[PDB]
Symmetry: D2
Subunit: 242 residues, 4 copies
């Protein structure tokens, strides 16, 4: 199998894209650690998918991340794949956005990616092998009304991805990003039915993404089938016009 015996930490994997990625990765032979702040959802994933491991983490909290990685290393002795998939939104027009809304999103969606990647790095470096996959967004690449903070963070993730691809290549580590288009998860759940049709109208394929579509891109970037893909932003967005 494509990920046989590989240990994968997937942040934000108690729900949505990350949860589906956990399942896909398990089907491909990986040992999967769901690292998520949502305990109830995490425990539900454990019950639903025999063999998956759940460890509670707040990716914005460096101590929490340190504990996560130590825990995984103690259990499995290695960390082969990190998917930085955890994210939040705190949408507001620029004219109304509070510092708290801005900083919260930076903390989770940008700094959290920094924390998790720094924490796994010494394990991958020792192994001389690793895959890091960072979740950006079409909002990061193209901008989006009401998302100053989320765009800042998701674009920032790309800058880090490109830097790390350059820094870590000599260590046998691949670093890439995925830019999902609008995808049917809880993150889209609270948007009005009206804007949903507008979002679909911007996609020539005429549909939103599914968690499985994005999980499939994570799988490509985590497997040997992408070994010469490095520093790339893989869009999975239906060809959205944005």
């Amino acid at each position: 199998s494509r990920l046989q015996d590989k240990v994968a930490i997937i942040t934000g994997a108690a729900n949505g894209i990350g949860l589906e990625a956990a399942r896909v990765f398990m089907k491909e032979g990986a040992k999967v650690v769901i690292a998520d702040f949502n305990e109830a959802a995490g425990k539900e994933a454990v019950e639903a998918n025999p063999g998956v491991v759940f460890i509670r983490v707040d990716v914005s909290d460096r101590e929490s991340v340190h504990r996560l990685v130590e825990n995984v290393a103690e259990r499995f002795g290695k960390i082969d794949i990190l998917i930085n998939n955890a994210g939040i939104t705190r949408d507001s027009m620029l004219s109304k956005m509070t510092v708290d809304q801005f900083q919260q999103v930076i903390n989770v969606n940008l700094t959290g990616v920094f924390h998790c990647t720094q924490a796994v790095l010494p394990y991958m470096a020792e192994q001389g092998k690793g895959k890091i996959i960072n979740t950006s967004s079409v909002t990061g690449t193209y901008g989006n009304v009401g998302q100053t903070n989320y765009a800042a963070a998701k674009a920032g993730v790309i800058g880090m991805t490109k830097t790390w691809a350059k820094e870590l290549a000599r260590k046998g580590i691949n670093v890439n990003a995925v830019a999902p288009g609008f995808t049917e998860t809880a993150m889209v759940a609270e948007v009005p039915e009206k804007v949903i049709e507008k979002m679909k109208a911007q996609v020539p394929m005429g549909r939103l993404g599914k968690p499985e579509d994005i999980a499939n891109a994570y799988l490509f970037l985590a497997s040997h089938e992408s070994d010469y893909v490095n520093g790339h932003v893989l869009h999975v967005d239906g060809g959205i016009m944005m």
Copy 2:
């Protein structure tokens, strides 16, 4: 290997050598019915001998009549065309100051117009099926430019413009259209440079190596399979993170 392309009919242009040949092999292992479509008869025949189950049909992608002969033959034999990979390509390198009109036009004819001919030829089959995958081979030279390659850069960048247009036009027909931009990859196309300049292009790749045909073939497989169904209008770089 899996069976991700089970019973899918794939035409891969330029598949008698290099990246295309490896893609033919990978696609066969994944269950596809593969047609190698290449101008090089001898290489095509050798590929068939070395890879039982593969079909070779000679084509010149720059010649529209040749392209229609190819596609009608594939349709007659297999009844459908699920995947087209526009992988055939040539180089006729020259500094701008010395480049002849023939060098420019030959590369446009094969690397740009040929992609147009093949895509137009397969389109009615895919439209009737309500499904299809088109994968166009661009290059880091198309995205970034490269000294001595005015013509090849024009063609490979042009391929991206067509890819993005087709992704918009054809999505409603159930067709995905994407491009791959390989970095420098170990094939005959690269073998014609001094190993001293090989280190130079290698030095621009943080991974410290050139691509292998299998690397590019693996990206073709991703873009041809259901695992990339929501990838559309995208240029997938397989270039080791090259600085260009």
Copy 3:
């Protein structure tokens, strides 16, 4: 004057964007040669703008281009600026596009840029200075339904631009491109008004480009104020969503 005594060849300058660029460049002190196939429009430009020079050219015809450049060189002794602005559209859905429609647009919009640039190059190389400005399009960068051929050509122009920036830098020559968004010229005059509103709807600024807007970008890229801009695609598109 930003272009004082600079000799500028502007292809396609008998109408539209190129005509306004000719006027803008004249105001900034340049000696301007309008090179266009439309003889009547060219002669009209000469009458309306005392001092402009018109030389008929078909940019797709190499011999025509060589006569143009010989004529300019014999007359002014130098060529400082080339703007490859001539272009045509022959739109069709892929399913219906003829080889002739495809090839004509390639001939003018892609090969013509090759011809003109190759012809001016020896002059710029001998002087150790020059500015080449190539006109691409948002259709080249983003694709556009009905424009397989135009997108091929305009994207191809970007590939050549980047190649030439690398090749010619050592000769003291800057090479850049402009990607106009939808702009009010004869090229848009044939689209239905309903489509005009659709085009505008994609532009957050809520208006189309003016010939002067694009001419202003040509001026920037032709002047010393862009001496360290090289190999760049300058979008003048109102932030169009495409």
Copy 4:
């Protein structure tokens, strides 16, 4: 006098690129406010460039920023142009980068841009006109070894730029970014001569940028000559290969 009587706030303008932009803008008729924390350099700029105004600001301090903007509005009655040019580096390989280094750079180079833009916005919205120019970097667009934090911030600036172009367009405000290549300022000063040659080797033009080159791009994006340029990242990098 392309900027005649326009009020421009240029953050970080006590030194380097910003200082040269202050000088260029004054020459073009602008009323320039240098906003910088470096008091000795700011005062020197005033003495050396009569007509310029210096107001002390720390862009990472929201209160300091609001005092700045209130001061400018009270004195000049309007704010026409904001250049978010202030920036710092705190370089380190990922393996050794501290949270302090990461956060300091985010605070100044990303959050500071948010603070300054939010603060000027109500004035530009009232005027129905304004120009916002954000300074990114080739490190943000391409990544650079040792610059995880700076790449995150400078890429994030592009995300915000694109979002703001979309949000603010119909208010008569242009929002664009500049991505300078390596440029001769104090930011590059303590780079070894051997590494300087390495950077030059990646630039086909064979030289680093000058502060005047970047200032000229700021001038383009601040003037009416770029009124239809929106949401664009203007590279001024000599065609660097990165």
